[PDB]
Amino acid sequence: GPLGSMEDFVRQCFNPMIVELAEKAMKEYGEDPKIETNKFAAICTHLEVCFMYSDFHFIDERGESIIVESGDPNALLKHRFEIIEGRDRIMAWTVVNSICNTTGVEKPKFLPDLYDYKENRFIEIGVTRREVHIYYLEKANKIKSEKTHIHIFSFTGEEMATKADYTLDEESRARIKTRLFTIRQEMASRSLWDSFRQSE
Numbered sequence: 001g002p003l004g005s006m007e008d009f010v011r012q013c014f015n016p017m018i019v020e021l022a023e024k025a026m027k028e029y030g031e032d033p034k035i036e037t038n039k040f041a042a043i044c045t046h047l048e049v050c051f052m053y054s055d056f057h058f059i060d061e062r063g064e065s066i067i068v069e070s071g072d073p074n075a076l077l078k079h080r081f082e083i084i085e086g087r088d089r090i091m092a093w094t095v096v097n098s099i100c101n102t103t104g105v106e107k108p109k110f111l112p113d114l115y116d117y118k119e120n121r122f123i124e125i126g127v128t129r130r131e132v133h134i135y136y137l138e139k140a141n142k143i144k145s146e147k148t149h150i151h152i153f154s155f156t157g158e159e160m161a162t163k164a165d166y167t168l169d170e171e172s173r174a175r176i177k178t179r180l181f182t183i184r185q186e187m188a189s190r191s192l193w194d195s196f197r198q199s200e
């Protein structure tokens with residue numbers, strides 16, 4: 001088949017909110033999304049996984065964790081997760097500082113991706129084109145000391161999470177894996193996958 005542009009794929013296969021947040025992040029770190037395109041696609045993918053990870057998860061009227069897939073349910077429900085990824089540095093740290101002071105949890109040395117109000121911990125999300133165990137160690141070794149939970153996804157369906165604690169139900173994580181599989185397949189049909197995979 002013909003080789004598509006990764007740019008076209010990103011703009012066609014991710015919603016504009018994701019794409020825009022991704023562009024802003026790259027600009028913020030001095031990289032151009034029209035040159036570092038594999039990174040661009042990687043950043044969109046990871047951002048989307050972060051959103052999908054928190055999607056539908058609330059804390060109920062009685063204070064336990066429930067799943068609602070409509071927009072019509074109860075406004076007394078609190079989102080289970082705080083989303084840190086996707087915010088600019090100032091706002092991300094503002095949110096982290098707020099959480100840390102409120103909940104009394106320890107302040108992380110690097111920006112995490114999520115905060116989980118049920119488990120009372122920050123989460124580092126990872127999405128890798130390599131084997132999950134290797135990438136996990138790379139994360140584990142950057143965060144140094146840990147209260148921060150790590151959860152790694154691959155494009156081939158493997159997961160690895162701290163202490164074999166996977167946080168979410170199988171259905172939630174299946175949605176994420178299916179999306180990753182779909183991204184991989186679509187890249188492959190445009191002959192973007194091999195280049196993307198080898199670039200990590």
Ligand SMILES: O=c1[nH]c(-c2ccc(-c3nnn[nH]3)cc2)c(-c2ccc(F)cc2)cc1O
Binds near residue numbers: 125126
């Ligand atoms: O696990 C993460 N990961 C990443 C991440 C994403 C892509 C690459 C990448 N892809 N190709 N070269 N570098 C590296 C780290 C990022 C990230 C997000 C926005 C941004 F502007 C820069 C980095 C954030 C994460 O939490």
Ligand SMILES: [Mn+2]
Binds near residue numbers: 085
């Ligand atoms: Mn970031």
Ligand SMILES: [Mn+2]
Binds near residue numbers: 113
């Ligand atoms: Mn992050």
Ligand SMILES: [Mn+2]
Binds near residue numbers: 113124125127
């Ligand atoms: Mn991450």
